[PDB]
Design a protein around this nucleic acid. Structure first.
Lengths: 686, 705, 249
RNA sequence: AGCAUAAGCAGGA
RNA sequence: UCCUUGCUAC
């Protein structure tokens, strides 16, 4: 035992302290003897000295210590008197000389080690080099030596003669690139080599001794020959055919609310009566529901009696000034209660012979055709409505003499166009109605509430609110981001219905309304639908649709001055045309140019439609129409573009067009773009 | 009258009317239900792209192993994508690569890489995305799964003293040599596990459905690895990161606009009297099913041929962990009767026993994956899924773009993760057919399959790279995400200035013209006011927070010095997006208002902008009623111990607290150290020093017992 | 007398049974991975749950003994400000926040607030004293650079700053002593003539030191001169299709 | 019924 | 075997 060999001449406390320092360093055994010799020698330096001194003695022993605290006490002394170390730690702290003291012990010549540490730090600190053989080459200043030196070379002769009597010379050495070579990993790495190799060693030697050859080009041309791939030009084989719009049943109206066929009742807005149930009550006295008699036989639809009893139940519910539907069969049938499958886990199944034969089957989505009603709602949606401001915007900040005026001017002018249109009425409808539905879906799960469908706008300066319908929640327990709770919508309209457009509705009749320019009809619509958590989060913040639109407009304006280097902004928004809206009987070079400012109207429309009809089909169709826009830009400058495989391309574009009315509409207008661009450029068909 | 919104493009470019074609104002499509069929499509599509049947039996794993390199069965349908790599061809491309720039290239980049590995601490593994915890077999953040891993280490055998990268990796390999591993299940029981099951569990990668990806019709399965693959992949991403930073034909770190100007301008000055240039935008298809890690093992065996002995075996372990990965197959499917009334749930475990209750596509995809299925997982050995090596495949792309065949017709370009731009220089059009088919030849041999549907070209610069459509002179910007303007949602003080920070960073990086900036500033202001129910004082809003403001408005003298959260107007602008609202408005506040708001003796804040509205909303209610209550007790204990370590070291959140001994012994030795330093120049009292010494010794005897 | 309190807290926390298996079993660095135990996934909808938070009546956790010293249980017309449901922390409404902001006590602390944020008030002071001019409407654009963006007068490189705060704030566990100290140690004497006696907490003090010494150098598209004063004037001066600069001084 | 689109929600403890 | 309840202001 090396410990018992040590304890014949090593001290007793140095076992615990020096062994503790070896436990601080790691798992070694010769460092016990190394810290024993160095620390015990430093104890021999501080053994009998300091006869009379200050409160603290002349020698301070902090080299052999818990390896956190020589730096801290070094900062207490060097911060007390004022000193600074030089990226090095000292062995014994001296205060009589106001310097440090560092001791090295070697077996070699005392010249080279002092050239090592003196090559490191120079004449900054004090270095003393000792040797078991009896060599001594150290720094030029000295002290009270030839007392401590006699005993320390006596001790090095003592332990040196012990090592001569025990033959331990290569074990007495003072002071990374090994990975832990495990067993299952080397059996795993040799198993996952490529097939012409046996072990990782042969692969490593062949990768370390690799030179290339000219059999590379023979395999390359041998890959060229068995290819059968030709490129397809456009100036000779311009097969950019129009897309395949499905010739089937027309796509219905799928928006949750009514845009073009809406009818609102008005009253002046009260500031004290501002909660949505109070707006519901004040429109129960304002819009007289006593004249809202409905026959139990609808014009068309699916379910007549349940909507009649549901409308009567919610009408007497609003009549008693409380919004909570008491449980009857109508609400238990319409908003889904108990209409869920029994989710049985696979712990009990109790199998029966040829009874409850169960499996699974999926179908997909059905295909529809080109909608004919979408053009009249596009041209209706960008037409100015006299009710003025709809969108609740905010105040304009003050401006310096910077470019801010320009920005402010643009914003003011663009806002002066967009507050009056009917798209602002639909955005206000979605914000107020879906926001109120959102707060009701948070505050009351498990209870069916009644949320009005309304707006707010300024009529002749008087701030008024509208009322477009009555919405009914479906006890939304929104656990996840999905959930698809059931909203029952009763809508107000003043036009004759259409079984092609209003296909999902359950149109009743409502009554008569006096309309001054005589007294026309009134049609109440019914529809059951569903919403989710995410579409509540996205529909209630549609005001961000104003964000990209101006950007597009501003790019045009900036590019104009980017071609001209002159402040032409106000007159450039007046004396510039923008092509839109070709006619129906003819298309070829018969386009309607409008002013550049009014164009922003049309732009906000399509941004709002991107808020509504977003599906997978619109995403993939937008990628592929970016491809065809790149082809048309390649046509515009006569660059002679080319394609490698058109057939699978049209199988992906004609794959990603199923049932979205915006996707079918923009596909049709893309084909008409190919006709109008076909009137000038030659890469297309008719 | 019809109408067409695309007609503006008849006299414009694709650099102005291209932000019109993005549906970024709507909701992204999400996934519903199980994600099993997508993983079956990925793995079974990989085995369909294996182009072989050469199977090799295994001694470690109980399942067969198919090879993916140098075993080709050449089908006639070569335009279909292949997944077979020729290693001598790609090593010839690497030798062709290093002969272009310098001589000691890989030695230099490998010495910088290993120079940064040896000075790296392992707590960097906690600064990442979500990982897979195999202890409870769920998805967790990086610090929780790392601390459960270290918990299994210190619970199984011994303690942990590493505090480095390399000793932690060697600790993981030492866990591979262990015969039995014990961890904690749930109410905290202690369970055990064998040796081969620990190998089956340490190499499990969890797949799920990619939610919110703008631009696809069908969904896709993303994969998340565990914890024992992350530091090795960090090593490989540092190596390939330095390699990509040194090269001149890559665009992952980023400038991506100067490089294309220098290569279009530099290669248009290398034309002869009859030569010309044609650029081709392409799109590499099936990028996650044709990158095998065995070619990564050969190339990473070639890069570090003269680096060290540590790096040579340390950069050759993560591809060996990618050749034998498992795949979680989701959570099963659901069966129902003819009446659609009772719907049983079949998990991923019993899918083999209930095989005969599936569809036609489910049995077609299921019988081509059957001889590779484990109980819960699958054995894929040639795939490189999402959330993996991304800076290393780009180096393969630069190797495909630096091919030299020996006329004077050649190519150059730029490479990304899966988007390349190729510039060809030649003399005639059938020679263009020869050069392009040679590019499809070298990419087809190496394992990169160009899509024939999404590729095109023109003669001048009209190409496409990372959704920036470059025209002949002008540059369009990236159509950025809209909801990122309002995603702070924490405070009445750190929302509007955070929104001005997002508007500022989108103004400097992207174009973001000033009218859009003022408009988005005003809309974010309006969503702030609609969020926190605070309106200006001159408005007619009468709620429970404007009644107090409208009642007490007479006390305020200077009315436009109020904050926006207290019913003030707007004073920030485009030229004030770097100054917060409070610091801009403190030159105009009333002294009663300013001394009343900014009082640190407030019941809301007590227990980067000024903290005077900073409140904390209340916690949830179902966090203490489920079976995971005791884990919230454990984070309470962790916050208590971290509060004690904050109570010992007065400056600990500034510097990273390195050290490898213990926490409590540094506490006790620190209280003794400051007890001596504050003793001799300070305290001086026997009852205080003896009482603190008595409590330290009693706490030490209590802690040791 | 703080070490007696720390002894009572350390002896109080070693009294627990299963807490002794936590400390003296990990490492010093594990404190970092003891800091983060966020069992929530990502908090993927912060503004959504924030609007769901503000729609209720008592969303806020507020202290009891500070608010009951001056506050009132209910306002003059039905406005609730208090609850009795639950540590002794009581739920409350933001009407009590604005009621504190208009009908509460006040403590004069303008010197401390105008001394912590010297960099940001320096930004406003440099912003108010500049002059602009006309626009240009010209093509402009250049590459991306690494630019120091703050007009500091010390210009350290994020390595003498952490070491500097170790050798200024708390030197008992600061760092191994380097060669970067010397002239900066004279600067340590100048900083120890400043941060000795203040009411500012050490985290806020280490925060406010790092904003007068650190030129924030970022990778931004720059054009024209590369002066560090006009780098908050980067996004205000020019974009891609326009430019406005007439700064005289 | 409906939302929805290759699979889920339409309560649960 | 059973159905607890949150209070909404553009």
């Amino acid at each position: 035992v090396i410990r018992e060999i040590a304890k014949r001449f090593l001290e007793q406390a140095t076992i615990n302290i020096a062994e503790e320092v070896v436990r601080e360093y790691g798992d070694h055994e010769r460092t016990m003897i190394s810290v024993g010799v160095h620390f015990q020698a430093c104890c021999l330096i501080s053994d009998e000295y300091t006869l009379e001194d200050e409160t603290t003695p002349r020698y301070v022993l902090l080299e052999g210590l818990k390896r956190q605290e020589a730096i801290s006490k070094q900062n207490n002394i060097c911060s007390t008197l004022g000193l600074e170390p030089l990226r090095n730690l000292a062995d014994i702290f001296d205060r009589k000389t106001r310097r440090f003291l560092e001791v090295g012990i070697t077996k070699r010549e005392s010249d080279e080690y002092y050239q090592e540490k003196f090559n490191k730090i120079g004449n900054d600190m004090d270095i003393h080099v000792f040797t078991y053989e009896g060599k001594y080459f150290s720094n030029n200043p000295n002290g009270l030596e030839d007392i401590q030196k006699t005993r320390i070379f006596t001790f090095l002769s003592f332990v040196s003669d012990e090592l001569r009597k025990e033959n331990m010379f290569t074990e007495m050495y003072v002071t990374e690139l090994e990975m832990y070579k495990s067993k299952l990993f080397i059996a795993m790495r040799d198993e996952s080599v490529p097939l012409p190799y046996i072990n990782y060693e042969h692969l490593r030697t062949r990768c370390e001794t690799f030179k290339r050859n000219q059999a590379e080009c023979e395999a390359k041309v041998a890959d060229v020959a068995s290819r059968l791939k030709i490129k397809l030009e456009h100036l000779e084989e311009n097969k950019l055919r129009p897309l395949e719009i499905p010739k089937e049943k027309e796509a219905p109206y799928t928006h949750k609310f009514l845009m073009k066929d809406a009818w609102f009742f008005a009253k002046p807005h009260d500031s004290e009566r501002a909660q949505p149930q109070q707006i519901l009550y004040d429109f129960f006295e304002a819009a007289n529901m006593g004249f809202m008699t409905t026959s139990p036989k609808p014009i068309f639809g699916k379910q007549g009696l349940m909507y009649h009893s549901l409308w009567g139940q919610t009408k007497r519910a609003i009549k008693d000034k409380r919004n909570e539907l008491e449980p009857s069969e109508q609400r238990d049938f319409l908003c889904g209660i108990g209409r869920a499958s029994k989710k049985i886990q696979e712990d009990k199944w109790q199998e029966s012979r040829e009874e409850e034969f169960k499996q699974e089957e999926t179908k997909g989505a059905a295909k529809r055709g080109f909608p004919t009603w979408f053009n009249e709602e596009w041209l209706w949606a960008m037409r100015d409505s006299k009710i003025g401001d709809w969108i609740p915007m905010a105040e304009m900040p003050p401006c310096k003499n910077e470019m801010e005026d320009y920005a402010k001017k643009m914003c003011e002018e663009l806002e002066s166009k967009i507050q009056g249109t009917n798209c602002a009425r639909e955005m206000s409808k979605l914000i107020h109605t879906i926001g109120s539905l959102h707060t009701e879906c948070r505050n009351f799960p498990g209870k069916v509430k009644i949320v009005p469908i309304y707006c707010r706008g300024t009529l002749r300066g008087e701030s008024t609110d509208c009322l477009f319908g009555i919405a009914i929640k479906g006890k939304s327990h929104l656990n996840k981001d999905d959930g698809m709770y059931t909203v029952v919508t009763f809508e107000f309209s003043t036009e004759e219905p259409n079984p092609s457009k209003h296909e999902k509705y359950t149109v009743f009749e409502a009554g008569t309304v006096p309309v001054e320019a005589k007294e026309k009809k009134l049609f109440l619509y019914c529809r059951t639908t569903g919403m989710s958590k995410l579409k509540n989060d996205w529909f209630s913040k549609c005001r961000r649709c104003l964000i990209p639109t101006m950007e597009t407009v501003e790019q045009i304006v900036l590019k104009e001055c980017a071609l001209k280097e002159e402040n032409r902004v106000s007159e450039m928004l007046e004396n510039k045309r923008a092509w839109i809206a070709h006619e129906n009987g003819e298309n070829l070079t018969r386009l309607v140019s409008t002013k550049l400012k009014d164009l922003c109207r049309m732009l906000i429309v399509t941004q709002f439609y991107y808020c509504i009809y977003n599906d997978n089909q619109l995403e993939g169709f937008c990628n592929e129409q970016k491809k065809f826009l790149m082809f048309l830009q390649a046509d515009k400058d006569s660059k002679s573009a080319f394609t490698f495989n058109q057939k699978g391309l049209y199988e992906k574009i004609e794959e990603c067009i199923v049932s979205n009315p915006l996707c079918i509409f923009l596909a049709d207008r893309l084909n008409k773009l190919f006709l109008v661009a076909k009137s000038n450029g030659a890469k297309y068909f008719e | 009258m019809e109408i067409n919104p695309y007609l503006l493009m008849l006299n414009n470019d694709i650099t102005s009317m291209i932000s019109l074609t993005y549906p970024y104002t709507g909701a992204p499509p999400m996934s519903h239900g199980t994600s099993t069929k997508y993983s079956m499509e990925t793995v079974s599509r990989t085995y369909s792209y294996s182009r072989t049947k050469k199977e090799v039996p295994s001694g470690i794993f109980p399942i067969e192993r198919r090879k993916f390199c140098n075993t080709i069965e050449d089908k006639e349908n070569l335009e279909k994508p292949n997944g077979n790599v020729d290693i001598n061809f790609m090593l010839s491309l690497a030798e062709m690569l290093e002969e272009k720039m310098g001589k000691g290239f890989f030695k230099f980049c490998a010495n910088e890489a290993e120079a940064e590995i040896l000075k790296m601490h392992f707590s960097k593994l906690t600064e990442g995305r979500q990982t897979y915890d195999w202890t409870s077999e769920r998805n967790m953040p990086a610090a929780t799964a790392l601390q459960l891993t270290v918990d299994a280490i210190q619970e199984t055998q011994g303690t942990f003293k590493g505090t480095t990268m390399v000793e932690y990796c060697n600790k993981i390999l030492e866990m591979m040599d262990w015969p039995e591993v014990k961890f904690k299940k749930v109410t905290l029981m202690i369970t055990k596990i064998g040796r081969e099951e620990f190998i089956k569990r340490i190499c499990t990668i969890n797949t799920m459905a990619k939610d919110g990806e703008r631009g696809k019709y069908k969904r896709r399965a993303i994969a998340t690895p565990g914890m024992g693959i992350r530091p090795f992949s960090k090593i490989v991403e540092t190596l390939a990161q330095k390699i990509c930073e040194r090269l001149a034909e890559s665009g992952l770190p980023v400038e991506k606009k100067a490089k294309l100007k220098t290569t279009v301008s530099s290669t248009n000055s290398k034309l002869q009297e009859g030569q010309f240039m044609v650029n081709i935008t392409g799109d590499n298809s099936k990028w996650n099913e044709c990158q095998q890690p065995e070619a990564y093992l050969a190339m990473l065996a070639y890069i570090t041929k003269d680096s060290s002995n540590l790096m040579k075996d340390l950069c050759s372990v993560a591809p060996t962990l990618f050749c034998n990965k498992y795949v979680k197959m989701g959570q099963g499917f659901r069966a129902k009767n003819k009446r659609k009334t009772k719907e049983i749930v079949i998990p991923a475990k019993k899918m083999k026993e209930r095989k005969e209750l599936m569809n036609a596509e489910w049995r077609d995809l299921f019988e081509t994956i059957e001889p590779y299925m484990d109980g819960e997982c699958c054995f894929l050995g040639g795939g490189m899924l999402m959330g993996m090596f991304n800076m290393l495949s780009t180096v393969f792309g630069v190797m495909t773009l630096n091919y030299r065949e020996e006329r004077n017709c050649y190519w150059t370009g730029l490479q990304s993760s899966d988007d390349f731009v190729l510039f060809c220089i030649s003399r005639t059009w059938p020679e263009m057919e020869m050069t392009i088919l040679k590019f499809i030849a070298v990419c087809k041999l190496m394992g990169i399959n160009m899509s024939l549907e999404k590729s095109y070209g023109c003669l001048p610069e009209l190409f496409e790279f990372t959704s920036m459509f470059f025209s002949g002179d002008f540059v369009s910007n990236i159509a950025l995400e809209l909801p990122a303007f309002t995603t702070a949602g924490m405070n009445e003080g750190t929302d509007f200035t955070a929104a001005m920070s997002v508007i500022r960073t989108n103004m400097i990086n992207n174009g973001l013209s000033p009218g859009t900036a003022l408009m988005a500033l005003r809309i974010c202001l309006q969503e702030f006011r609609a969020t926190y129910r605070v309106h200006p004082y001159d408005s007619g809003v009468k709620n429970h927070r404007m009644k107090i403001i409208r009642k007490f408005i007479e006390t305020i003298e200077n009315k436009d010095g109020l904050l926006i959260s207290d019913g003030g107007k707007l004073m920030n602008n485009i030229s004030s997006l770097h100054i917060p609202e409070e610091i801009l408005k403190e030159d105009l506040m009333d002294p009663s208002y300013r001394n009343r708001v900014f009082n640190p003796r407030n019941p809301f804040t007590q227990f980067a902008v000024v903290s005077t509205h900073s409140f904390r909303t209340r916690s949830n209610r179902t966090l203490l009623n489920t079976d995971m209550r005791a884990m919230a007790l454990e984070e309470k204990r962790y916050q208590v111990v971290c509060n004690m370590y904050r109570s010992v070291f007065e400056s600990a959140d500034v510097n990273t607290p390195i050290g490898s001994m213990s926490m409590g012994e540094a506490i006790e030795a620190k209280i003794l150290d400051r007890a001596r330093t504050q003793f001799e120049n300070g305290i001086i009292g026997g009852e205080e020093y003896s009482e603190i010494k008595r409590l330290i010794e009693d706490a030490k005897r209590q802690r040791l017992s | 007398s703080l070490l007696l309190t720390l002894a009572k807290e350390y002896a109080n926390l070693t009294k627990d049974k299963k807490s002794c298996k936590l400390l003296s079993q990990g490492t010093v660095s594990s404190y970092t991975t003891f800091k983060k135990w966020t069992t929530s996934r990502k908090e993927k909808n912060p503004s959504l749950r924030m609007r769901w938070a503000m729609g209720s009546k008592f969303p806020i956790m507020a202290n009891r003994e500070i608010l009951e010293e001056a506050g009132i249980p209910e306002q003059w017309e039905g406005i609730d400000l208090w609850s009795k449901k639950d540590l002794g922390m009581v739920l409350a409404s933001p009407a009590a926040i604005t009621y504190w902001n208009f009908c509460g006590p006040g403590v004069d602390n303008s010197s401390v607030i105008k001394d912590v944020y010297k960099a940001k008030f320096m930004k406003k002071e440099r912003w108010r004293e500049t002059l602009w001019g006309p626009m240009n409407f010209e093509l402009v654009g250049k590459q991306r650079r690494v630019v120091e963006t703050q007009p500091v007068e010390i210009k350290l490189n994020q390595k003498e700053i952490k070491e500097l705060t170790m050798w200024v704030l708390f030197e008992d566990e600061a760092n191994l002593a380097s060669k970067f100290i010397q002239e900066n140690f004279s600067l340590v004497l100048s900083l120890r003539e400043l941060y000795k006696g203040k009411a500012v907490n050490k985290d806020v003090a280490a925060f406010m030191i790092a904003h007068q010494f650190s030129p924030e150098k970022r990778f931004l598209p720059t054009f024209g001169p590369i002066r560090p004063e006009r780098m908050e004037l980067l996004h205000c001066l020019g974009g891609d299709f326009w430019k406005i600069e007439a700064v005289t001084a």
